[PDB]
């Protein structure tokens, strides 16, 4: 199984150093000795009620006092009353009133030493948010407050002003425990199985000394891709372009069909004149060994065997291009003079740069960047990677081994919940209904008849555009049997996850009863050869997940590919296995107009895509003119053949671009024909149950809070006094994630007034516990910080 570690770019030590633990400890007690002098007080109330019917005033009132849990009036407690009442209650009432007391003068002064903590902790939040990795993550992020954050650091008592200090400490919680990519955020790299013998401590993992993160600086795809059109449009860079065929292009013996640009795609259909007929079927013939077209030996080729005219064979192949039935793409990136400045500022070694530095070099390059090609509604044009080259962490098999056994089990049981199944059950019923059982529908009559089904109105539409159409599940009322089956599966398998004791606040499910429950299930339910599972060990052997998608290396090929990078040689990423006989996995080619999806080649075959060219033998390329759509017999689900090959074609996205930035015939492909899934994470407060597959934390631990019960600020630090109250009085912890997720540390008074704000105007608060908790980072070698992990496991 393989294995990669992010972490998160700051230590554990940066957040845990913003707590006003003093003042915290304290508003703790003050809370929690609340509580307990109210619940006595009542309890008095009834002893001394009981004491005043045994007898056959004052009484009354010191009763009532203890009831309501005020002091008692000087009238109500006295020696002549504490002598009538029994030894025993006269002395709980005595200690009541003495705690009382304690307790009144401790409020009194709480607002000062909590004041005085929390300014304190402007200047920690200075400290933790110089480290350079931090600020130069800020920097790319947000420059102008890191400019600010500069200038603190060179000017200090030159206090900033709240919002600034609420801005930089939610990106420091950010860099201290979450771990998403980012900047140097975080940090990426592998992780190996050390085997065995060596983990007489106990440990689940160990780690190197901690690597310098190197960064990879790219540009935006969508940037990249308009600028390089641009390009490819100029007359001049014919000559340095290559050509070929739209791998689209189907001839229907009187019109050409075929995909044009991206991202819009439109499905065209164009009428073919004998010079065009003739100029396309020579394309083959004028083409490498594999499948490019010199463009000056094409239009002497053209001027030849038509008439000449070449001023017109030009003006032709120019019309071919524009239209896109001919695709046009550089030779090598352009070596042209812009081209390789931008390349160079790309691939500059920032050693030896501070954050200023760094600013200024990207606000340059942006500018050579839009005197270039628009920004537009681009929003970021330049990300940056960080990755380490030599192992993180070794593992122990021993200590993993229950864990994965049951994740496995998970990864399978919750195929039943995949957002696309519905999507497969649908196409499979249109194509049944529309060309019947037996029917083989090239894959383009296939994509166009749904996407004409679903811009239109017909009821035979109807489903296609409420499960494949925009917007986002109404099942168990369906027309169609199968979705009225998955309903009722998906009932089945969540009240046999819930159907069960809440002990300490966890459900706990035990694998088997998982393995039993799918042994029952129909074939069409068909669960991934692979997952990329992103875990967090907690506690006693947990395993915690947070996210799941497919997996035949998909992230690990981008992680492969970025260490190759920074290292000066490729990383021998393994290639997806074709098997049983008779089927293979093919990836769409090249990188569908995203830096995200540039990684090592895994699959034999590729999908070859309209403008994306990518990086195989003309033997191997798959192109969507040659794919067709059956129903299969085993499952009655749609799949997808190989018209030259006859092979079961997978389509496979292993590149780490989101599905809707994949243009619409490759969403298409991997939605309705891809084997991957996606996991991600009234009027009271709601409590819900962690729930646990042995070893593996499925939902962690939740608390459902209503607008109206969540305190607001109506009031200065007793407001983080009265919000402790009812978070203490609801069994909600110190630190948890709220809803993205914002890290909420109570102790922390920068996260409390980041979540008071946040929550504002909100229907419901969700509150979820930590977990790990970031006190449960795993310890380190020598000087090097214990920090929060993820790890990315690759399971099959």
Known sequence: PKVAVRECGLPVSAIES??????????????????????????????????IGERGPVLVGLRRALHTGRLPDAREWTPRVASALPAELAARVADWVTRMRALTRARRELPELFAAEARVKEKVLAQVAADPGFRRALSL????????????????????????????????????????????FTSMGVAVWENGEDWADGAIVRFAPREPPSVILEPSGEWLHGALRAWLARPENLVRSRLRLNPSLVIRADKAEFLGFPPREPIIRMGLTPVVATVLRLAEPAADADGWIDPMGFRDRLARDLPAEPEQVDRLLRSLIE???????????????????????????PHGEDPEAYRVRLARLKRAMTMMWPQGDTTALLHETAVVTRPVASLNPTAWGRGLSDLDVVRRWLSVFDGKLPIRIVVAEY????????????????????????????????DLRTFVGRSAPPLAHSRLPRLRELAKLREAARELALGRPEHDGIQRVDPEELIKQMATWPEWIVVPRSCACYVQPAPEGRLVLNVVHGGHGRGLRRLSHLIGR???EAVDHPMVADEPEGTVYAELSGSLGSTLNVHVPGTRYEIDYPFSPGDRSRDRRLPLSDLEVVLAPETGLAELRSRRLGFRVIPLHL???????????????????????????PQEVTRYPRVEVGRVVVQRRRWLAPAGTLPIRADDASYLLRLVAWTDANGIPTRSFVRKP????????????????????????????????PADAPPREGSDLPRVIEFLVELG
């Open 18 to 51: 913003l707590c006003c633990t003093d003042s915290f400890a304290l508003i703790r007690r003050q809370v929690r000795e609340t509580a307990w002098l109210k619940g006595e007080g009542k309890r008095l109330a009834v002893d001394l009620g009981l004491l």
């Open 141 to 184: 992020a947000s420059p102008e407050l890191a400019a600010d954050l500069d200038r603190w650091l060179a000017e200090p008592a030159r206090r900033p002003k709240t919002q600034k200090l609420l801005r930089l400490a939610k990106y420091v919680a950010r860099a201290a425990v979450k771990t998403s990519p980012y900047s140097t």
């Open 323 to 349: 239209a896109g039935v001919l695709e046009a793409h550089p030779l090598t990136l352009p070596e042209t003079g812009e081209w390789a400045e931008i390349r160079a500022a790309l691939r500059h070694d």
């Open 431 to 462: 194509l049944r209904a529309r060309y019947g059982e037996h029917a083989r529908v090239p894959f383009l009559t296939f994509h166009r008849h749904v996407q004409e089904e679903i811009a239109g109105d017909a009821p035979s539409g109807a």
């Open 566 to 568: 920074v290292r000066g």
């Open 655 to 681: 590149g780490m671009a989101a599905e809707f930035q994949l243009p619409p015939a490759a969403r298409f492909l991997e939605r309705a024909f891809g084997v991957t899934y996606l996991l991600h994470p």
């Open 742 to 773: 914002l890290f909420l540390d109570l102790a922390n008074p920068f996260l409390v007034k980041v979540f008071e704000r946040q929550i504002r105007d909100c229907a419901f608060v969700l509150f979820e516990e930590a977990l790990p908790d």
